[PDB]
Write a protein that binds this ligand. Structure first.
Ligand code: NI
Length: 160
């Protein structure tokens, strides 16, 4: 259980480094994965990225049992499948006390590596696409506030 970084911290603004191929398969990485799951599971979250616990790497976990399959995604790449967009709620463990409306692609393809280096290649929609988009925004130093276009829907959770 590592500490989750809060918005304002300059490390949630780095572009993350890719996972070097030597770490694929390794115990070192697997220790990282188990810490992330340990941390995300504890604060009740749906997703975590490596940057949010201090680690400069292109590595995200996500899962929910609008179900999303448990996944460890490395070195990700995203391709919107068409122009259609969709507004929904987003919160973030780095942005405590707050919620906002964001408009994300409805349909995406994502690609990357699993923890052993096997290729991942999926097309998804709806909440699944949202979560992947939100997570991969971390690996580029973007938090959901920098994506809001309707500030009428941005505010404190105990208010909204
Ligand atoms: Ni987040």
């Amino acid at each position: 259980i590592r500490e989750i970084l809060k918005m304002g911290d300059e490390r949630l603004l780095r572009i993350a480094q890719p996972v070097p191929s030597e770490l694929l398969g390794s115990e070192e990485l697997q220790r990282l994965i188990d810490d992330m799951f340990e941390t995300m599971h504890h604060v009740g979250g749906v997703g975590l990225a490596a940057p949010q616990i201090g680690v400069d790497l292109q590595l995200v976990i996500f899962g929910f049992e609008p179900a999303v399959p448990p996944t460890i995604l490395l070195n990700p790449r995203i391709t919107p499948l068409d122009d259609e967009m969709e507004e929904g709620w987003e919160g973030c463990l780095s942005v405590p006390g707050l919620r906002g409306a964001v408009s994300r692609h409805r349909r995406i393809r994502y690609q990357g590596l699993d923890p052993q280096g096997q290729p991942i290649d999926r097309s998804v929609e709806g909440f699944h696409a949202r979560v992947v988009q939100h997570e991969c925004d971390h690996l580029i130093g973007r938090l959901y506030p920098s994506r809001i276009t309707d500030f009428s829907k941005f505010g404190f959770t105990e208010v909204l």
